[PDB]
Amino acid sequence: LRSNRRREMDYMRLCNSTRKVYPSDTVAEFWVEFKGPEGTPYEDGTWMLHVQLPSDYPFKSPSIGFCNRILHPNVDERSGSVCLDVINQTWTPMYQLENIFDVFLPQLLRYPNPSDPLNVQAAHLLHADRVGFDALLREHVSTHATPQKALESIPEAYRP
Amino acid sequence: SNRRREMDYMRLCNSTRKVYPSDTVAEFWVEFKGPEGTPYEDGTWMLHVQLPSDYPFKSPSIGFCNRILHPNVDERSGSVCLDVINQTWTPMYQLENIFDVFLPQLLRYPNPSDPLNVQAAHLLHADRVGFDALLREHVSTHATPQKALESIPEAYRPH
Amino acid sequence: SNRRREMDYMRLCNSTRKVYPSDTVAEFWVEFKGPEGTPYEDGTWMLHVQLPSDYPFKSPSIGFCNRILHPNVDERSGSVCLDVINQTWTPMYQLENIFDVFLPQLLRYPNPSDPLNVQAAHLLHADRVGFDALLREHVSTHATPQKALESIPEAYRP
Ligand SMILES: [Cl-]
Ligand SMILES: [Cl-]
Ligand SMILES: [Cl-]
Ligand SMILES: [Cl-]
Ligand SMILES: [Cl-]
Ligand SMILES: [Cl-]
């Protein structure tokens, strides 16, 4: 693991705040608590995000994965990984890491990005019957996206 | 079809913002409150927002439906100066920031672009204090929540 | 003369921010609160902000009038490292973000630029927990709302 001082700075700034950040053994990997945006079927949901910062950060974007289950066209259902193409449309070397959590993810949950879906089934349901899809979402969220399920989705070695 | 226009419209609607739809994603009305600490602070306006076919490479157009006095806003039509919008707009710009950042900042103090309301520009530079009083009065009569709601075309106004 | 500087000064003043004017748009004082979740969180400072004649092509200068301990700030003069400001500043940068984003983020963790305060850099590296305790105590004595107010030059102090 190499001495990237931009990665170190941004990790420390994220931790030195009111955000709920659970560390690994390195600044390259950590877990961040995330709340679904108000006014969406995700609004009552809590998720744990697996965030990784690459060795050439911030020239390469962070990777983001939902640890507990989420249903979203741009998110792989099994792994939780957020589509790399969608992240790269927003990310630049000047982009503020905080805005991933404050702007990018909430906006993404408000309506998907038109990028080729990682969850094809969610894309199909959204376009066929949005009202029914939203009801399906709310139910899924109430069961999978509790604060408790988010907490237990942190790997045991780093779970409080 | 313009998938980016669709996306940004839907994200605006799927929020706590007060957005009143037309029959298409290309046109809609948004409630807007004047920024605190300005003569506009007690005002409510309805914004006529249009998203062009080549959005977001071409910027949205923005119009105040109920009356506002501002150097960069055409008094009769309510249209916000296109040159002023283009100084801020880029294909990467977030549509929400038009309402959250661009418009509030604009109302805090005008952009030095050739004014659409030349009277407002001259009053502002001759006597700022008197102009601010003139604004507060105009705002208290024309920028009520009621006047904002009524300025939505009848076909799309909540009944 | 400089219409952009005039515009950005007026927008800063026409808000809920606490801005204390000088005799010109080129120089003024802004109240600043330390960011929550840091050893600076209970702090209030007065910032000496100067907008140059070639603004916004040249960045503003920022000085902490009442004392702060931070690797990227010279305590004696108060001045925020010019190199750090220039990493963020561009002619399209919004002045409000200096106060809302740039300074709060800087206080959460220093920029790796050669420190103006070498003492603070050494303390942070050697023992972060002890340094954060040192910070909290310093802040409680030097960064009160009263000390921030008194640090404005008497000619422009309310
Ligand atoms: Cl660590
Ligand atoms: Cl997106
Ligand atoms: Cl529609
Ligand atoms: Cl502007
Ligand atoms: Cl002045
Ligand atoms: Cl910085």
Side-chain angles (χ1 to χ4, degrees), chain A, chain B residues 1-158, chain C:
Chain A
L1 201 127
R2 61 219 88 168
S3 184
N4 181 335
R5 304 169 303 179
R6 321 303 295 195
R7 171 167 67 180
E8 175 191 75
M9 174 186 60
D10 279 6
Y11 170 84
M12 292 296 180
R13 292 174 174 187
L14 205 65
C15 292
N16 220 14
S17 69
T18 59
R19 301 175 190 274
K20 293 175 183 277
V21 178
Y22 310 85
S24 68
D25 279 325
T26 158
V27 307
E29 179 179 41
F30 47 95
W31 297 267
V32 183
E33 187 185 283
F34 176 79
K35 311 290 260 190
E38 194 184 0
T40 65
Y42 301 102
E43 67 183 3
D44 293 342
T46 308
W47 287 275
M48 197 63 53
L49 302 173
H50 182 205
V51 184
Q52 300 172 264
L53 305 175
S55 74
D56 51 350
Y57 179 89
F59 300 89
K60 185 178 191 298
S61 69
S63 62
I64 314 299
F66 282 80
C67 303
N68 52 319
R69 293 291 177 95
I70 192 175
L71 296 186
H72 188 285
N74 303 125
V75 184
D76 184 59
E77 191 177 333
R78 170 178 281 182
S79 71
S81 100
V82 180
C83 182
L84 298 191
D85 167 33
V86 312
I87 291 168
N88 288 324
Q89 288 181 22
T90 294
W91 189 262
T92 70
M94 298 311 277
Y95 197 84
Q96 291 294 296
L97 188 58
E98 286 72 18
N99 285 337
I100 291 301
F101 314 100
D102 296 344
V103 180
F104 168 73
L105 286 163
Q107 284 297 106
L108 189 63
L109 268 54
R110 287 187 206 279
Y111 202 78
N113 180 288
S115 174
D116 282 349
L118 292 186
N119 191 331
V120 174
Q121 194 64 230
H124 182 251
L125 298 168
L126 180 68
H127 293 102
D129 185 6
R130 188 186 181 180
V131 175
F133 181 65
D134 282 4
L136 195 139
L137 252 41
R138 286 198 149 87
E139 193 177 10
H140 187 274
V141 163
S142 79
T143 178
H144 286 95
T146 59
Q148 190 195 235
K149 282 207 179 294
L151 205 65
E152 55 194 21
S153 72
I154 304 168
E156 187 174 327
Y158 307 110
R159 194 188 303 145
Chain B
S1 319
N2 192 326
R3 300 184 299 190
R4 332 296 299 183
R5 175 164 67 178
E6 177 189 60
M7 174 187 55
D8 285 359
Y9 173 80
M10 289 300 181
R11 291 174 176 186
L12 208 66
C13 288
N14 211 13
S15 74
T16 60
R17 304 171 188 274
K18 298 189 184 281
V19 178
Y20 308 86
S22 67
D23 48 347
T24 70
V25 299
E27 179 181 31
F28 50 92
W29 297 266
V30 178
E31 194 194 72
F32 175 77
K33 302 280 189 183
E36 206 181 343
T38 77
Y40 301 103
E41 67 193 336
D42 294 331
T44 302
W45 289 269
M46 198 60 50
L47 305 168
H48 182 213
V49 181
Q50 302 176 264
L51 302 187
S53 64
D54 47 342
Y55 178 93
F57 298 92
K58 182 179 171 174
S59 70
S61 68
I62 310 294
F64 284 84
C65 300
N66 53 314
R67 288 170 156 105
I68 196 177
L69 303 179
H70 190 281
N72 306 121
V73 182
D74 186 76
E75 188 173 334
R76 171 178 282 180
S77 72
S79 73
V80 175
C81 180
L82 294 294
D83 302 308
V84 174
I85 293 166
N86 287 331
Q87 289 182 18
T88 294
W89 192 264
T90 75
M92 284 97 103
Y93 197 80
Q94 303 306 314
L95 183 61
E96 283 74 14
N97 286 335
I98 294 298
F99 316 107
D100 294 350
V101 179
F102 165 76
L103 289 166
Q105 285 298 104
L106 187 59
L107 270 57
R108 288 188 209 284
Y109 205 76
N111 179 292
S113 192
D114 286 344
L116 296 185
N117 180 342
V118 184
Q119 298 173 118
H122 282 233
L123 285 170
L124 179 69
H125 293 105
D127 196 344
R128 210 264 168 88
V129 171
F131 182 56
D132 281 353
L134 185 158
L135 290 180
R136 288 195 151 85
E137 182 61 42
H138 181 98
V139 164
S140 78
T141 90
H142 297 104
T144 48
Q146 293 78 229
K147 287 215 175 268
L149 216 49
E150 307 211 298
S151 69
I152 303 182
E154 199 186 341
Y156 305 109
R157 198 190 300 154
Chain C
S1 71
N2 190 327
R3 296 185 305 181
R4 271 97 218 326
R5 172 170 68 180
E6 177 189 72
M7 167 186 59
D8 283 1
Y9 171 83
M10 290 301 164
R11 284 179 180 183
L12 217 64
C13 293
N14 224 27
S15 72
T16 61
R17 303 171 192 276
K18 307 231 272 185
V19 174
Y20 308 86
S22 70
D23 287 310
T24 171
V25 300
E27 182 182 31
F28 50 94
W29 295 269
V30 182
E31 187 184 275
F32 176 77
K33 301 280 188 180
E36 202 180 347
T38 73
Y40 304 104
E41 64 186 347
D42 287 331
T44 304
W45 289 271
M46 198 58 52
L47 303 175
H48 186 210
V49 182
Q50 294 174 279
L51 306 181
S53 53
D54 41 1
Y55 176 95
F57 301 91
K58 188 171 195 290
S59 64
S61 69
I62 310 292
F64 280 80
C65 304
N66 55 323
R67 291 164 174 81
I68 190 167
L69 308 184
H70 187 284
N72 304 125
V73 183
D74 176 54
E75 180 199 351
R76 173 163 269 220
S77 72
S79 76
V80 178
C81 180
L82 283 319
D83 297 332
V84 322
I85 290 166
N86 279 328
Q87 294 184 15
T88 54
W89 190 263
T90 72
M92 291 271 80
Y93 195 88
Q94 305 309 125
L95 188 60
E96 279 80 11
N97 287 335
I98 292 297
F99 312 101
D100 303 340
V101 179
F102 167 73
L103 289 172
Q105 287 294 108
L106 185 62
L107 268 54
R108 298 188 195 279
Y109 204 77
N111 181 287
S113 187
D114 288 326
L116 288 186
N117 187 347
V118 185
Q119 293 164 109
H122 281 219
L123 287 169
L124 169 67
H125 287 121
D127 178 11
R128 198 235 171 107
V129 175
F131 181 58
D132 284 355
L134 172 159
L135 248 29
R136 282 187 201 101
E137 174 65 24
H138 188 91
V139 164
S140 78
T141 171
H142 297 98
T144 57
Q146 187 177 311
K147 277 198 187 291
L149 205 65
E150 294 174 336
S151 72
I152 295 165
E154 89 175 62
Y156 307 108
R157 197 188 297 145

